[PDB]
Structures are given as structure tokens and as C-alpha cells.
Amino acid sequence: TSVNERIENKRRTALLGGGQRRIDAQHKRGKLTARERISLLLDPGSFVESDMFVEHRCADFGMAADKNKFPGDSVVTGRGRINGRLVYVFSQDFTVFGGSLSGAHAQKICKIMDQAITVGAPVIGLNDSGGARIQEGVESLAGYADIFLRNVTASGVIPQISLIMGPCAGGAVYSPALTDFTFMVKDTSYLFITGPDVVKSVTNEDVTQEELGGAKTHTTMSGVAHRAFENDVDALCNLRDFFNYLPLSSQDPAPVRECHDPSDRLVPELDTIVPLESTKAYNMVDIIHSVVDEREFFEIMPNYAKNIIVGFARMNGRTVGIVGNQPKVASGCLDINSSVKGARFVRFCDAFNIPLITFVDVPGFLPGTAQEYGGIIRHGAKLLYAFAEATVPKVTVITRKAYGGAYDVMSSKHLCGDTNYAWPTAEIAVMGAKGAVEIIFKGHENVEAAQAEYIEKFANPFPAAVRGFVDDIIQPSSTRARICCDLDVLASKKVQRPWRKHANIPL
Amino acid sequence: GSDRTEALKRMADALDNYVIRGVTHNIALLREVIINSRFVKGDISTKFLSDVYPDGFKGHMLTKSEKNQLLAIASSLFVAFQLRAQHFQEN
Ligand SMILES: O=CCCCC[C@@H]1SC[C@@H]2NC(=O)N[C@@H]21
């Protein structure tokens, strides 16, 4: 046959991956093939593939036989466009050697990552792989490291997104951990370093793959995944939606798109949302929905550490990050998991020039020996450092309580915040009124009159307002308008810091 | 209205223009009663709701043309959202 005909033969073979029977087996599991996933994710007719004909070079254990040669070698890589914006994508092909990672696999992934870093565009990885290709021995390990390094080199330069759509075990799990966001598909994807068999053999524990590393486990217990989706199709649609928010690189400002919601729209429904009695809770998500454009909010880790809320939204068409206390869960007290969840989100938002909006209602930190033995001190320091380090515009609104060091942590103006607002129900104090009266006036019998005077003078936002700790006390209904105005003024904020290789954040 | 028809038409229009969010509400039933051919003819009694909806209220029932109009509106809205998704500012 001529060279051309062999070219068509190779193209056709590559387009089928591991064979039609393998594709059918993949489909009966309820999973799409890599190329189908790429087709769903990218704009139609925009996918440009790279390295179609690359094949593995292993020569051991009969790996050099023609039946062991697959063009592409279990990964499809290239570039495309989402809503017209450039992106680089790789998708792992489970039908070729179970999607195991080989030298060529890592080489292709590294090529696309280098291209993306060179031009400054995000990287999306659809992960479905058993693990390292044992037949290539140490070679596979090297490839993994080659990926890891690039991830670390790309951190804070271009956004990186991982979507776990199948089995993922061993060292391969670490690359998604190094990316900015990880999404999981329910019932068909899992993450764990060691499989259930080794767990049973070593620790005598009985567990299934779903229990060990299922999407629910990593979205509700381990705090490893950020979102879980029902299907591949649903996951890909939501992935496009989410990608619409991010900037292409750290050299670009926060994306601003066409907006129809007026920036001065009033929100009268917030004037009575906060109950007067501090013993009743409300839903901060309602406030967030009311304030943001079109009531649209993309929440991150919605089912993990629910006492805090983090997500993406738009104000006047500009992407913003939302962080808020949730009084509806555990009184809105901070703790370990919530601290970590807020801290990493804040750091990501700051790294890519996304302004931050914070809603503060926090009585303090969760007490108990479990929190202390778990290292609550360093975990809370994580969030405090995250707010203190950020140089993007920061807008804070206090709805109800802000007590003790929790007030400092939640982007207090003393952390070089930009604008801080207090609703009429705000309470900035060192601690509760009863405890403060107990400490201050203890040893005096006329406790009642002193306590009444103390509550009249201090159980309100006046102590902070008179000192300038809050820029103003605003009617809740105007909240949105105020915020929008500020975000227009602060778009050109620039801050000078001392030079350093990097900081040393608590871990 | 100046006559019964004008009053019933302005009502139907008013019920379609009424925004209520955060609770469920009876506007769908009210709107269906007002346009019902018995109600419009004045063929009504204290049993009207039980006679007109014996099985229960299932909401409006679309005629082929109404279904096509609804589908077209939904498709246009979907396409409009998709199109607005592509309108970034200059980079
Ligand atoms: O039983 C109630 C008396 C003590 C409650 C103090 C609460 S627990 C949540 C918050 N964090 C603190 O450190 N104190 C308050």
C-alpha cells in the first residue's frame, strides 16, 4: 500500500482508540469515550488535535508487538475554544491499556501544557486512567513527575481544571490535587492512592471503591473535590458554564461580559432578612442570590463544610468571588474544614485578579477538644493569612455578629481591606455582652444596671463606626448598589509589597 | 372594564403580569377560571370548580399552536442565553 493509504488507516485506527468492542464496553458502563467528551466540551468545529500518530516506545514483555501499538496511546490532546476563548485540553482514553500512563502519554500532556503556558491559556484535563503502565516501569514514574513539575510551574500563571470521569488510582491522583479545581462524576469516578484490596490486606478493612474514593466521599468528607455531577453530559455542560467565569491567565483582569441587570437595582427584601433576636438563624445564600446579577451563583463545595459559603458570581457583568458565613449551619462558627475551604478559594481568587466580596456573621470558632487536637490554630491562621495577603479589591458587609478574632479573620479593614460596611444589625465586639459584663464588672453587686448600660452603649455597630472600622452603616436594600459602585472605583487598585521569593503560609 | 369582556381580558393580562416568588400561589387556577368558556358565558354555580376540574387542577392544557409557541419561545431563550455567553469585553 502507498504511504497515503497507510495514513488513512492510521487515522481511522486512532479515531477508534482501543477498538469498537472496547468502546461498547465503555458505553455500557454509562461513560463516554475521550473524543466524545472533547466534542461535547469544545465549540463545534474548533478542536485542533496534536500528536495523533504518537505511539509508545516500550519494548519489554512483548509490548513491541503490532497488536500492542495504538496511535495516540490512550490520550487525546489538543486545543479548542469555549464561547470563543482559547483553551488547551487533554482527555485520557480508558480503552487503550485501561488508560494507563506511559512515556508517550506524559509526553503529549507535557507538550500541551508547555504550549498553554507559552501562550497563556487555561488547561482542562479529563482524567480516566487506571494508573501507571507497569510494563514501562520507571519510565512511567518519570512521566508523572514531568507532569507534576509543570503543574507546580503553572500554578498561579494559568488556571488549571481537572474533571475526574473514571477510575483514578495511584500517583495519578496527585496531578488533579495540584490543579485549582477538581470536579467529579457521580457513580463512575473515584480517587484513591491505594485500592480496596490493599486496604483489606493491610488494615483488615472492608470497603468498596465507591466508599473508598467515590464522588460523594470526596465531595462531603475529604474536601478533595469541589463539585459532583450526575453524568458526563451534565458535567461537561457545567464545566463550560464554570469556565466562562475565569480569566485566561494571570496577566488578564477579571472577565467582564454583557450585563442586563441594572447595577443600581434595589433589594428591599433584605431589609428584614436578619432576625432581631440573635438566637434565630437565616440563610446567607438568600442574601447572596439577591445581591448578585440575575440571582446566579456558582457554589464551590456546596455539600462540604456548610458553615461557610464560597462561590463565583457576577456584579455588573464582572466576575467576583463570594465568601460568607452561614448562620444556618453550626451558628456560622468557623472551624478547620471551613477555614481551609475559604482559604484556598480566597487565594485562588487573589492569584487571578478576581475581586472578593465577604458577608460576615460569625460568633467565633467552634470549641471542643476535637478542634484543638486537629490543629484549629494553624487552619484558622490559613484563612486569616489568605485575607491578609490578597491584593485584589476586597468589599466586606457585616450582617449581624462579628466577635473576637473571627472578626479580624473575616477580611477586617485592618487587613488592608478596601471598603467595610455594617448593616443596622451589626455587632462588632470582643465577645458577647453577657461575658464582657461578667469579666468587667465581676465583684460588683449592682450587675443589672451596669449590664444595661453596657448593652446600650456597646451592643451595636456604633463602637466600630465611631473609630472608622466600618466606612458606613448602610440600609440593607442599597447593598447591591453600593457594592457595584465600589467595584468600579477599585478596578485600578495597585499595592506595593516587600520583595520575596514567596511567603511561608501555615500548612 | 366598560363591559364584562374588557374586565375579563384585563384580568387575564394582569394575572400573566403578576410576579410572586418564594411561595407557591393560585394565579394558575385564577387565570384558568377567568378564560374558561363556562365562566366567560356566565354558566357558573357554587360547584363550578368541582364540575370543571373533577380529577383535580392539572394546569393549563396547551393546544397544538400553544405548544409550538411555547417551544419556540423556550428555544429562542436558550439560544439568546448561549449567544450572550460569548460577549466578553475587549481583551
Ligand atoms: O452553651 C453555651 C455557652 C457557650 C457558648 C459559646 C459559643 S459556642 C460558638 C461560639 N464560639 C465561642 O468560642 N463561643 C461561642
Residue with cell 453596657: A454
Task: Compute, in angstroms, the gap from residue A274 CA to the centroid of ligand 1.
Answer: 20
* A250 and A348 share one domain: no
Neighbours of A246 (CB within 10 A): 23
Instruction: List A429's β-bridge partners, or say none.
Output: A403
Name the amino acid, one letter, at A379. Answer: H
Instruction: List A183's β-bridge partners, or say none.
Output: A163, A227
Please choose from A307, A336, A361, A366 the residue to mutate so as to test ligand 1's pocket, defined by most ligand atoms within 8 A of CB. Answer: A366
Specify the number of domains making up chain A.
Answer: 2
- Yes or no, beta carbons of A85 and B88 under 8 Å apart: yes
- Yes or no, beta carbons of A256 and B85 under 8 Å apart: no
Distance CA A335, CA A340 (A): 9
Instruction: List A428's β-bridge partners, or say none.
Output: A402
For residue A73, give the nearest of A94, A59, A47 by alpha carbon.
A94
Nearest atom (ligand 1) to Cα of A365: 11
Pairing of the two strands A123-129 and A160-169: parallel
Question: Whole domain around residue A207: which residue ranges?
Answer: 1-257
* A160 and A76 share one domain: yes
* A139 and A157 share one domain: yes
Contact of A223 with A337, CB cutoff 8 Å: yes
A456 contacts chain B (CB < 8 A): no
The DSSP code sequence of A325-358 is E-TTTGGG-B-HHHHHHHHHHHHHHHHTT--EEE
* A313 and A437 share one domain: yes
* A61 and A182 share one domain: yes
* Residue A251 in grid coordinates: 496577566
- Residue at a domain's end among A240, A257, A274: A257
* A210 and A309 share one domain: no
Radius of gyration of chain B (CA): 19
Distance CA A104, CA A140 (A): 9
Contacts with A252 from chain B: Cβ below 8 Å: 91
Q: What is the resolution of this structure in A?
A: 2.2
Residue with cell 520583595: A499
Find the helix or strand (DSSP H, E) in which B69 lies. helix B64-84
* A382 and A472 share one domain: yes
**DSSP label at A172?**
G
**Chain A nearest C-alpha distance from B83 (Å):** 9
Catalytic residue flag (residue A171): yes
Please identify which of the residues A313, A406, A422, A429 carries the catalytic annotation: A406
- Please calculate the CA angle B12-B18-B21 and round it to the nearest 5 degrees: 140
Burial level of A266, CB count in 10 A (0-12/13-18/19+)?
middle
- Yes or no, beta carbons of B91 and A248 under 8 Å apart: yes
Give the A window 255-294 contacts with B, CB below 8 Å: 255-258
Please identify which of the residues A120, A121, A156, A171 carries the catalytic annotation: A171
Distance CA A33, CA A22 (A): 10
Which residues 6+ apart lie within 8 Å of A352 measured at CB?
Answer: A156, A159, A246, A247, A250, A254
Distance CA A28, CA A202 (A): 33
Radius of gyration of chain A (CA): 26
Which chain A residue has its CA at the smallest distance from B83's CA?
A83
Which residues 6+ apart lie within 8 Å of A29 measured at CB?
Answer: A188
Distance CA A201, CA A204 (A): 6
**Chain B nearest C-alpha distance from A154 (Å):** 21
A303 contacts chain B (CB < 8 A): no
- Note the residue count of chain A: 507
Catalytic residue flag (residue A380): no
Name the amino acid, one letter, at A188. Answer: T
Find the helix or strand (DSSP H, E) in which B76 lies. helix B64-84
Contact of A254 with B88, CB cutoff 8 Å: no
Contacts with B83 from chain A: Cβ below 8 Å: none
Task: Compute, in angstroms, the gap from residue A432 CA to the centroid of ligand 1.
Answer: 9
**DSSP label at A367?**
P
Would you say the CB of residue A363 lies under 6 angstroms from ligand 1? yes
- Residue at a domain's end among A202, A225, A257: A257
Catalytic residue flag (residue A103): no
Contacts with A244 from chain B: Cβ below 8 Å: 85
For residue A321, give the nearest of A349, A296, A287 by alpha carbon.
A349
Largest CA distance in chain B: 67
* A16 and A159 share one domain: yes
Nearest atom (ligand 1) to Cα of A331: 9
Catalytic residue flag (residue A406): yes
- Yes or no, beta carbons of A258 and B91 under 8 Å apart: no
Pairing of the two strands A75-82 and A48-50: antiparallel
**Chain A nearest C-alpha distance from B82 (Å):** 8
Burial level of B86, CB count in 10 A (0-12/13-18/19+)?
middle
**DSSP label at A445?**
S
- Residue at a domain's end among A241, A257, A273: A257
Neighbours of A2 (CB within 10 A): 7
- Yes or no, beta carbons of A257 and B84 under 8 Å apart: yes
- Yes or no, beta carbons of A83 and B85 under 8 Å apart: yes
* A363 and A494 share one domain: yes
Nearest atom (ligand 1) to Cα of A363: 10
Task: Compute, in angstroms, the gap from residue A394 CA to the centroid of ligand 1.
Answer: 29
Contact of A311 with A326, CB cutoff 8 Å: no
3-state helix, strand, coil in chain B (%, to 5): 60, 0, 40
* A287 and A199 share one domain: no
Name the amino acid, one letter, at A201. Answer: S
Burial level of A441, CB count in 10 A (0-12/13-18/19+)?
middle
Strand runs labelled E in A279-343: 298-300, 308-315, 318-325
Residue A398 zone, left/alpha/beta (φ > 0; ψ -120 to 50; rest): beta
Contact of A232 with A37, CB cutoff 8 Å: yes
Please choose from A331, A407, A410 the residue to mutate so as to test ligand 1's pocket, defined by most ligand atoms within 8 A of CB. Answer: A331
* A141 and A71 share one domain: yes
Contacts with B19 from chain A: Cβ below 8 Å: none
* A291 and A247 share one domain: no
The partner residue sitting opposite B86, judged by closest CB among A84, A248, A252, is: A84
Contact of A76 with A49, CB cutoff 8 Å: yes
Name the amino acid, one letter, at A274. Answer: V
b or e along A22-43 (b: 16 or more beta carbons within 10 Å of the residue's beta carbon)?
bbeebeeeebbbbbbbbeebbe
3-state helix, strand, coil in chain A (%, to 5): 45, 20, 35
For residue A154, give the nearest of A127, A184, A128, A180 by alpha carbon.
A180
Name the amino acid, one letter, at A269. Answer: E
For residue A286, give the nearest of B81, B21, B20 by alpha carbon.
B21
- Note the residue count of chain B: 91
Contacts with B85 from chain A: Cβ below 8 Å: 83, 244, 257
